[PDB]
């Protein structure tokens, strides 16, 4: 209302600021799959056990994962365990019933740890050796070019049909080099 | 976000980026209207303006403050002033870069923060490196010609942009010595 | 389609203004109405830029006469023109001969200061004016410390300046 209305419209605010997501849908199994399976589970008598996850949309995940992958840390998604990002099991998308998601988000979390530790290492040289200083400089010189390509993709998100398998495949020559 | 960020980075603290002398620039970080995703990129940007305000404060405080000066090199003397001049001239690309950012904000105000962050990542290494070079000289009460050596050892650096950037300050402080010796000899 | 919903770092130029308005209202609530913003937005940019071009000429601006971070930028460029006018007030004369020749040589520089403004910018960025007049406005505030803005006049000046 009047400022929260404008906020709710143009900015999102729905899992990471408390506002239960009423995102419209076309239901009918291909995008209703989590609900279809939950209703099936209840009809087979679990018994009861309501599963509570807070329902993020699809594209928001992909954008957040981009910002995770580029090299900046501390996002809302992905529970950290020591400084190791893992899959968040407190969110859910309208289909896939949180299992395929649990696999693929684990893959990107595996990449997120490798980039997290390297960027933390580079940060801890600025707070000599004459060889560590050149080493972090080479690592950094890679990272800036890598981060640039991620950032232009994230810019081009706002400017179409976005799903996982395009941005995953497009970043194959980057996650290969990351290993 | 559009003008506010450039205003913070130029060295005018606002009510979003609140100046302290113990924490420099700082986000308010108590609103649920901004979120952990943008927060981190913003803190990374806050560092540069904090160091910038320190730099400009020192330069202004000790250059153009007396006619031309008894004596302590960490507070007085021509050499400290010529240092501050060299430090101001190396900061000129920072001004030029911020100016270009405003042009892109004018071209489209819905461009990502990570683009800005990517632009300013090269200063992200350079500013903390020169900060300790100035901080050691002022803290240790370094007098006279030892200042020229202290910067010279830090122009043996293992970062090439930092090395060339400090070399320019060394060129200025050499210039004043050239100017004096040219009459003395 | 409805869009991809950009955040409050990329959805401004409208939510920027709403965010500033909300922040100002929040501060006024958190104080008690004892704070009183003078509307640091409206006027916009080009009108503001023309006003600060006018204060460097020697004539008074729209808040000073003898986004909220604009106040910090504004004070720094306002006190510049306040010094220029008080320097012309010190050079107001048609007595020591060398003192007169000194004052006329000062006015030969004040003319340069008047010539640099409004020959380079017609109207430009709000940051450009401060950056362009940083290496030069510092010289103008050096002149306030130099002059009397006891004090040497005449022969005393002829020795003191030498």
Swiss-Prot record, chain A:
Q: Where in the cell is it found?
A: Cytoplasm, Cytoskeleton, Microtubule organizing center, Centrosome
Q: Which superkingdom, per the lineage?
A: Eukaryota
Which species is listed as the source?
A: Homo sapiens (Human)
Family note? Belongs to the TUBGCP family.
- Output the lineage of the source organism: Eukaryota, Metazoa, Chordata, Craniata, Vertebrata
UniProt lists the gene as: TUBGCP5
Indicate what this protein is called per its UniProt record: Gamma-tubulin complex component 5
Expression tissues:
Widely expressed, with highest levels in heart and skeletal muscle and moderate levels in brain.
The annotated subunit structure for this chain is: Component of the gamma-tubulin ring complex (gTuRC) consisting of TUBGCP2, TUBGCP3, TUBGCP4, TUBGCP5 and TUBGCP6 and gamma-tubulin TUBG1 or TUBG2. TUBGCP2, TUBGCP3, TUBGCP4, TUBGCP5 and TUBGCP6 assemble in a 5:5:2:1:1 stoichiometry; each is associated with a gamma-tubulin, thereby arranging 14 gamma-tubulins in a helical manner. Gamma-tubulin at the first position is blocked by TUBGCP3 at the last position, allowing 13 protafilaments to grow into a microtubule.
Q: What is this protein for, i.e. what is its function?
A: Component of the gamma-tubulin ring complex (gTuRC) which mediates microtubule nucleation. The gTuRC regulates the minus-end nucleation of alpha-beta tubulin heterodimers that grow into microtubule protafilaments, a critical step in centrosome duplication and spindle formation.
Swiss-Prot record, chain B:
Tissues expressing this chain: Ubiquitously expressed.
The source's domain of life comes to Eukaryota
| Compartments where found | Cytoplasm, Cytoskeleton, Microtubule organizing center, Centrosome
Illness the protein is tied to: Microcephaly and chorioretinopathy, autosomal recessive, 3: A disorder characterized by congenital microcephaly and chorioretinal dysplasia associated with poor vision and nystagmus. Variable ocular anomalies include microphthalmia, retinal folding, retinal detachment, optic nerve hypoplasia, absence of retinal vessels, round areas of chorioretinal atrophy, and attenuated electroretinogram. Most patients have mild developmental delay and mild learning difficulties.
Quaternary data: Component of the gamma-tubulin ring complex (gTuRC) consisting of TUBGCP2, TUBGCP3, TUBGCP4, TUBGCP5 and TUBGCP6 and gamma-tubulin TUBG1 or TUBG2. TUBGCP2, TUBGCP3, TUBGCP4, TUBGCP5 and TUBGCP6 assemble in a 5:5:2:1:1 stoichiometry; each is associated with a gamma-tubulin, thereby arranging 14 gamma-tubulins in a helical manner. Gamma-tubulin at the first position is blocked by TUBGCP3 at the last position, allowing 13 protafilaments to grow into a microtubule.
What this protein is reported to do is described as:
Component of the gamma-tubulin ring complex (gTuRC) which mediates microtubule nucleation. The gTuRC regulates the minus-end nucleation of alpha-beta tubulin heterodimers that grow into microtubule protafilaments, a critical step in centrosome duplication and spindle formation.
**What family is reported?**
Belongs to the TUBGCP family.
Protein name, per record: Gamma-tubulin complex component 4
Species assigned in the record: Homo sapiens
Gene designation:
TUBGCP4
Boundaries of the shown chain within the full protein: 1 to 191 of 667
UniProtKB/Swiss-Prot annotation, chain C:
- State where the protein is found: Cytoplasm, Cytoskeleton, Microtubule organizing center, Centrosome
Tell me what organism the protein belongs to. Answer: Homo sapiens
Function of the molecule = Component of the gamma-tubulin ring complex (gTuRC) which mediates microtubule nucleation. The gTuRC regulates the minus-end nucleation of alpha-beta tubulin heterodimers that grow into microtubule protafilaments, a critical step in centrosome duplication and spindle formation.
As for family, the record states: Belongs to the TUBGCP family.
Q: Report the gene name.
A: TUBGCP6
Q: Which disease is it linked to?
A: Microcephaly and chorioretinopathy, autosomal recessive, 1: A syndrome characterized by microcephaly, cognitive impairment, underdeveloped retina and choroid, and epilepsy in some patients. The more anterior parts of the retina, near the periphery and pars plana, have a grayish hue and diminutive vasculature similar to retinopathy of prematurity. Visual impairment becomes evident during the first year of life.
Name of the protein in question? Gamma-tubulin complex component 6
Listed under subunit, the entry gives: Component of the gamma-tubulin ring complex (gTuRC) consisting of TUBGCP2, TUBGCP3, TUBGCP4, TUBGCP5 and TUBGCP6 and gamma-tubulin TUBG1 or TUBG2. TUBGCP2, TUBGCP3, TUBGCP4, TUBGCP5 and TUBGCP6 assemble in a 5:5:2:1:1 stoichiometry; each is associated with a gamma-tubulin, thereby arranging 14 gamma-tubulins in a helical manner. Gamma-tubulin at the first position is blocked by TUBGCP3 at the last position, allowing 13 protafilaments to grow into a microtubule.
Mapped onto the parent protein, the portion here is 305 to 506 of 1819
